[PDB]
Ligand SMILES: O=S(=O)(c1ccc(O)cc1O)N1Cc2ccc(O)cc2C1
């Protein structure tokens with residue numbers, strides 16, 4: 001009783017995703033009239049976001065697209081789109097529509113649970129089947145950043161709806177903490193990483209936290225954010241900083257601590273994690289964010305979480321000494337706007353690459 | 364008695380520039396047979412490098428190319444190319460050829476002395492005459508990085524020839540110090556920046572230097588490098604770090620010092636300059652390397668000096684606290700290879716941009 005998926009994909013891919021600000025997410029209420037609004041918004045917005053990214057999947061190299069794991073993920077997206085299409089003609093006034101819709105979103109979230117490692121298997125299949133080539137590799141890199149960020153955004157919309165309209169922290173709005181204590185999240189991530197480091201190495205570096213609240217030097221630093229995302233980024237950074245520290249100090253009983261600075265400025269809330277884990281040459285930094293060399297998507301995915309609300313995650317090392325990692329976040333909820341890839345000529349053109357000698361000299 | 368310039372430009376632009384390593388520059392001797400070799404090399408290589416970049420000038424937007432200052436710089440390049448063409452049929456065995464050639468190179472260097480600010484006037488003329496647009500601006504950015512790096516490389520070849528074949532440090536090979544003490548250059552740059560800071564603010568931050576020689580903890584850190592280039596980068600960084608420090612501490616008599624770490628690893632020699640000058644939001648970092656917003660090319664040009672021998676110069680700030688700047692250099696002379704732009708399809712295509720909506724969403 002539904003049209004073929006391609007008809008829906010073509011229709012919805014014409015629209016641009018509509019980025020929401022942290023402030024907008026937060027300003028969304030929990031009434032039945034709010035739920036109807038969420039419903040009528042999401043039955044348009046989720047298909048738009050699904051369609052847009054599905055169109056880009058089709059731009060992947062034939063070699064990548066032909067892999068069974070990429071084809072599997074595609075099929076999940078198709079079914080999720082179709083699931084939502086069942087609601088196009090349903091009455092928001094009917095409470096059964098709303099409850100069924102929430103169930104359908106839960107089913108979609110579960111279906112897509114293993115998307116990240118499934119796509120990674122697809123990349124591995126491409127490499128095993130054909131051997132990798134630099135043109136395909138660049139396309140894969142460009143695509144995966146956009147695909148994973150798109151996924152993050154879709155999961156955000158679904159979690160917001162299901163959490164609000166169906167409780168550890170009643171003060172949270174869905175997955176959003178309007179008063180996230182940044183240092184508390186830092187400590188939580190450190191604690192968990194320490195458990196892992198202690199398990200394997202029977203030791204771990206201590207943590208030192210310093211806050212710089214530029215405008216209000218006394219006040220503990222808080223922000224509007226999704227703590228699970230911040231936790232995710234910090235846990236990944238701690239794991240790397242701890243491993244570097246212990247491994248570069250095999251002969252020592254005294255380990256240099258990991259130092260974190262949390263700075264609050266007018267526009268940025270920045271979190272720097274500094275280790276003395278011996279560092280890595282500049283040449284090897286890019287590779288840390290590479291899906292190909294990582295085929296462990298911890299770092300590239302953490303950076304996408306940072307970028308999702310207009311932030312970033314940057315690494316700077318000093319080979320022979322150690323490494324600084326910085327999470328840049330927007331200080332203000334009004335500046336924290338979803339960063340969403342969109343399917344258009346620009347995106348399309350970016351895939352249109354091919355083999356040739358670069359614009360810089362080789363000896 | 365010479366052909367029209369375009370015939371020479373077309374001929375020489377077919378070749379790729381030939382990048383030399385620091386080790387190769389250094390291994391070049393000072394005999395008459397070495398001079399003849401330098402001559403026969405440079406009468407081919409300099410025209411290749413001149414032609415390659417001249418071809419890219421022609422790819423600039425009509426709006427930029429039409430400016431009197433860009434046209435002036437172009438005319439200098441044309442005359443310099445032609446000057447060298449006078450030597451195509453000359454006998455290297457004749458000492459008069461060699462001496463005349465050295466004179467011609469000196470004349471070229473002098474002719475091009477004001478290239479950097481003359482091009483900047485061209486950018487200003489474009490902005491004043493037409494108003495700037497983002498497409499042209501991106502082209503200008505791409506082109507100027509390549510144009511200025513090309514210029515750096517040409518100046519390197521000329522200085523090497525004129526210094527060697529025509530003396531404060533007899534141990535230097537042309538402009539190259541085979542035993543450059545990095546901390547000494549740091550101190551020289553600091554001293555000069557301090558003079559300027561003291562003049563305007565009647566105070567300046569102190570300097571603290573720490574060295575980390577990973578493989579030989581006792582040994583002072585030395586490298587093969589061109590000290591004037593290292594000095595140039597450090598002076599620019601000190602000026603910025605000092606200004607930030609003093610201006611963000613208007614009420615204080617106590618200024619936090621500027622801290623420099625010089626680290627020597629297996630592959631990198633890295634120099635970090637840390638200030639507590641209050642920092643800048645991430646949003647504003649890109650602009651620091653922008654020729655358009657700088658229309659003060661100090662930072663972008665310093666970064667090009669770093670990139671010229673396969674290094675880099677990177678800035679990381681923490682708004683509300685301060686800024687780290689890192690110069691990354693190759694530790695080994697064999698890894699220090701000229702980075703030279705080349706005129707080919709790839710370079711050509713990169714100019715082929717135009718107006719459209721980007722691949723990311725706007726609200
Ligand atoms: O790349 S690192 O500098 C680095 C990368 C990311 C990060 O967040 C922190 C780091 O220190 N570091 C990793 C590591 C892991 C094991 C080991 O023996 C040495 C090192 C160095």
Ligand SMILES: O=S(=O)(c1ccc(O)cc1O)N1Cc2ccc(O)cc2C1
Nearest residue numbers: 600603604606607610640642643686688
């Ligand atoms: O951008 S900065 O962080 C910066 C940029 C480059 C650099 O090398 C060091 C820096 O601190 N800094 C400049 C400056 C100059 C004057 C002022 O009042 C404040 C600031 C901040």
